[PDB]
From a paper:
Each nanotube was derived from coalesence of three protofilaments derived from the dimeric protomer. Among all three structures, the helices within the dimeric asymmetric unit could be superimposed with only minimal differences. Structural overlays of laterally interacting protofilaments indicated a conservation of the interfaces between the three filament structures. However, the axial interactions along the contour length of a protofilament for the Form II-like assemblies appeared quite robust and comparable in energy and buried surface area to that of Form I protofilaments.
Residue numbers in the entry:
A (entry chain 5), B (entry chain BA), C (entry chain HA), D (entry chain NA), E (entry chain TA), F (entry chain 0), ...: 101 to 129
J (entry chain d), K (entry chain j), L (entry chain p), M (entry chain v), N (entry chain X), O (entry chain R), ...: 1 to 29
Write the structure that this text describes.
């Protein structure tokens, strides 16, 4: 099951990346 | 059943890949 | 019934393959 | 009835085959 | 009634055969 | 699981970044 | 976990910044 | 944790600032 | 923690200011 | 006993819906 | 007893729907 | 009793729908 | 009692629909 | 026992919904 | 035992909902 | 045992809801 | 053991609610 | 162990409620 | 240990309630 | 240790109740 | 130590009750 | 020491009860 | 007094329902 | 007083329903 | 007072329904 | 006294329900 | 006394429910 | 005395519930 | 004496519950 | 004496609860 | 004497609770 | 003597509580 | 003698409380 | 003799209280 | 002899009270 | 003095209860 | 003084209840 | 003072209830 | 002060209910 | 202050209800 | 502040309802 | 801020309803 | 009114006569 | 009224006659 | 009324006759 | 009334006969 | 009444026969 | 009554037989 | 009654057999 | 009764076997 | 009874085994 | 019984082992 | 019993070890 | 107030008159 | 206020008059 | 306010007048 | 506000006038 958990971890990491990228774009605006 | 679980794991991995790729594209924009 | 379950497993595996392939194409774009 | 179940299993197997073949074609594109 | 059930089983078997044959043709394309 | 926790941490960090950036924009207005 | 806590701290700091900025704007009005 | 506490302190300080500013406006009215 | 306490003190001071200002307005009416 | 035959008819109607959906696919192409 | 015959008619109508769907497929080609 | 005959007529109408669908197929070719 | 005769007429009309469908087939050829 | 066949029909209807959704996808393209 | 098959059908219906949502995405683009 | 499969279906339905929400986002843009 | 998978599905549903709320934000703009 | 994951989901749901409230704010403006 | 995470979620939910109340204020204006 | 965080959340919830009451005032006007 | 923070929260809740009562007054007018 | 703060909160709650009673009076008029 | 007549009308309506049911029987034959 | 006449009309309408049901019988024959 | 006349009209309409039902009978013969 | 007549009407309505159920039986055959 | 007749009607309604259930059986066959 | 008849009706209703349950069984098959 | 009949009805209702549970079993299969 | 029959009914109801629990088990599988 | 039968019913109810708990276990898995 | 059987039922209920607690454990995992 | 069995049941209930507490621990983690 | 078993149960209940307190500790952390 | 075991249980209960007090301390912090 | 009028109202309410009970009687007949 | 008027209103409400009960009687007839 | 007017309104509402009951009577006739 | 006006509105609403009841009477005639 | 205006609107709505009831009267005539 | 305007709109809507009721009167004549 | 404009629109819509009601009056004449 | 009742009695008598005559005819068949 | 009751008695007698005659016919079949 | 009761008795007797006749027919099958 | 009771007895006897006959048929299968 | 009891006895005997016959069939499977 | 008891005994015997047969089947699996 | 007791004994014996068989299967896993 | 006791003994023995088997499995993990 | 006691002994032995095994696992962690 | 006592001894020994192992882990931290 | 005592001794020894280890950690802080 | 009391007296006198008149009528019956 | 009381007195007097008049009419019947 | 009270008095006087006039009319009938 | 009150007084006076005038007309009839 741990594989599922680490998959979730990578999911959330990517989500955070999307968030901070949108943040950088907002900062550029 | 464990085969189903690892299938799900690979599913979510691919989903995370899609997410981070869309994130990289957003970053390029 | 287990045959049905492993059939489902292969289904989901193929679905994940489709997903990651679409992801690679998105990455190429 | 089990015959019906294994018929379903073969159905789903063939469906998965169609899926992964379409996936390979998508990959070729 | 069981005769009806096994008839259905053969039906679904033939359907699966049609499916996998169409799949092989798709693979050839 | 700790990976999930640190993912959450990065999430919240990014959220705080969004917040303070919106704050800086409000300050500019 | 402490990382989560300091993330929260930064969150609340940003919130306070938003608050005092809104306060400065109210003062300007 | 003390960081959280001082964050709270700054929060409440900003709140007091909002309060006294609203008070000054009320006084002007 | 004392910072929190003095924050509270300033809070209550501002509240008293609001009160006496409302009182002065009532007196003007 | 008739309800058994009702279930059989349900089986067959399901199969019919399968074929109808297959036609829907093919028409969609 | 008649409801038994109703179920029989339901069987037959299901079969008819099967054939109709098959025609739908063929027409769609 | 008449409802029994109604069920019989339903049987026959189902058969008629079968033949009609067969004609639909053949016409579609 | 007449409703019995109505059911009889329904029988006959069903048979007529059968023959009509047969004609439809033959015409379709 | 019939409820077992009801479950079988449910299986098949699910498969039909799968195919229908696949058609929906393809039509959407 | 049938409830097991009900669960299987639930699996398949879930997969169908997945595909339907994917179509919804693609249509939305 | 079937309840295990119910949980699996719940997993998949959750994933479907994820994709549906993603579509909701994209449509909202 | 299944309840573990229930918790996993809860994780995923939470993530879905996150995305849905994000869409709600974006739509609100 | 699953209850740990329940707590994780609670974390995420809390974050979702945060975002939802943020949307509520923005909509209110 | 999980109860610690429960407390964290409580922190976050409190923050969410803060934002919700802020929205309530703004809506009230 | 978690109870400390519970107390922190209590602090924040108190602050939220403050803001909510402020909104209640403003709405009452 | 946490009980100290509990007392702080009690302070704040008291202040909130003050404001709520003030709103009660104003509403009563 | 915290009990001192408890007494302070008691002071404030008393004041709140005063204001609440004043509102009760005014409402009673 | 009128309610007495209402009861009389109820009597008559009951009798009418009797006759209607008798007709239902006869029609059913 | 008029409600008395309403009851009378109810009597008559009941009688009418009687006759109508009698006609229903006779028609059914 | 007019409602009295409404009741009278109701009487007459009831009588009309009586005659209409009588006609229904006679027609049915 | 009228309630006595209400009970009589209840008797008759019960008898009507009897006849209606008898018709239901006969129709079911 | 009327309540006696109510009980009689209850008897009859029970008998009607008996017949209705018998019809339910027969229909179920 | 009427309550005796109520008990009789209860007897009969119980018997009706018996038959209804028997129908439930048969339908379930 | 009637309470004796009530007990009899209780006996019968118990038997009915038995049959109902048996149906529940069979349906569950 | 009736209470004896009440005890008998209790016996039977217990047996019914047994069967119901058995069904609960089987359904749970 | 009846209380003896009450004890017997208690025995049986205990056994039922045993089976119910067993089902609870199995469901929990 | 019956109290002996009561004690037996107590034994069994204790065993049931054991199993229930075991289920509680397993669910908790 | 029965009291001996009561003591036995007490033993078992104690064991059950042990297991319940163990579950409480595990849940607490 | 039974009181000996009561003492044994007391031993076990004490042990259970030990474990419960241990859980209380762990939860408190 | 049993009283010896009672004393043992007293020992254990004392130890439990120790642990409970330790938890009380830790909770108090 | 008002309490005298309260007693008067009690008198009247008693009389009303008398009439209501009389109606209860008459309805019961 | 107002409570006197409350008593007066109680008088009147009692009278109203009287009339209402009288209506209840008359309706019951 | 307002409560006096509340009592007046209570007087009037009582009178209204009187008239309403009078209407109830008249309607009942 | 506003509550005084609320009482006035209550007066007027009472008067309105009076007139409405008067209309109810007149309509009832 | 706005609640004062709410009370005014309540006054006016009451007056409107008065006029509406007057119309109800006149229409009823 | 907006709620003040809401109250104003409520005033106006009340006036509109007044005029509408006046029209209702006039139409009723 | 937008909600302020919503209130303005509410004002205007109220005025529109006023004019519409005036038209209703005039049309009614 | 009693005249109406005896009219009803004669009605039902005639109905019973019709019933038993139809019964005699059924017996002759 | 007793005339109505005996009319009902004769009704039910005739109904029983119909029932037993239908029973004799069923027996002949 | 006893006439009604004996009518019911004959009703139920005839019903039992129908039941046992249907039983004899089932036995012949 | 005893006639009703013995009627019920014969009813239940016939029911038991039906049951054991169905049992013999099941045994033959 | 004893006749009813022995009827119940025969009922339960037949039920047991059905049970053991179903058991023998299960054993044959 | 003893007949009822021995009927119950045979019931439970058959139930035990079903149980041990299901056990033997489980053992064969 | 002893027959009931030995029936219970056989019940519990069979239950123990089921338990140990499930145990042997668990051991095989 | 001793048979019941030894049945319980075998029950608990089997339970202990299940426990130690689960223990061996835990040890293998 | 001693058999029950030794059963309990084996129970507790197995429990201790589970405990020490969990302890060894904790030690390995 | 001594077997129970030594079982308890082994229980407590294992508990002490768990304790000292947790202690060693705490020491490592 | 002495085994129990030495078990307790080892318990308390381990407890003292936990205490002094916590003490060493406190000393390190 | 005494006027109210004598009014009540006359009320009750009239009520008694109604009662004795109804009594005389009952006596005439 | 006394004017209100005497008004009530006259009210009740008139009510008594109505009562005794209705009584005289009942006496005439 | 007294003006309102005397208005009420005149209201009730007029109501009493209406009552006694209706009473005189009833007396004339 | 007193102006509003006296307006209400005049309102109620006029209402009483209407009432007594309607009363005089009723008296003339």
């Amino acid at each position: 099951q741990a594989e599922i958990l680490k998959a979730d971890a990578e999911i959330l990491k990517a989500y955070a990346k999307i968030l901070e990228a949108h943040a950088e774009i907002l900062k550029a605006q």
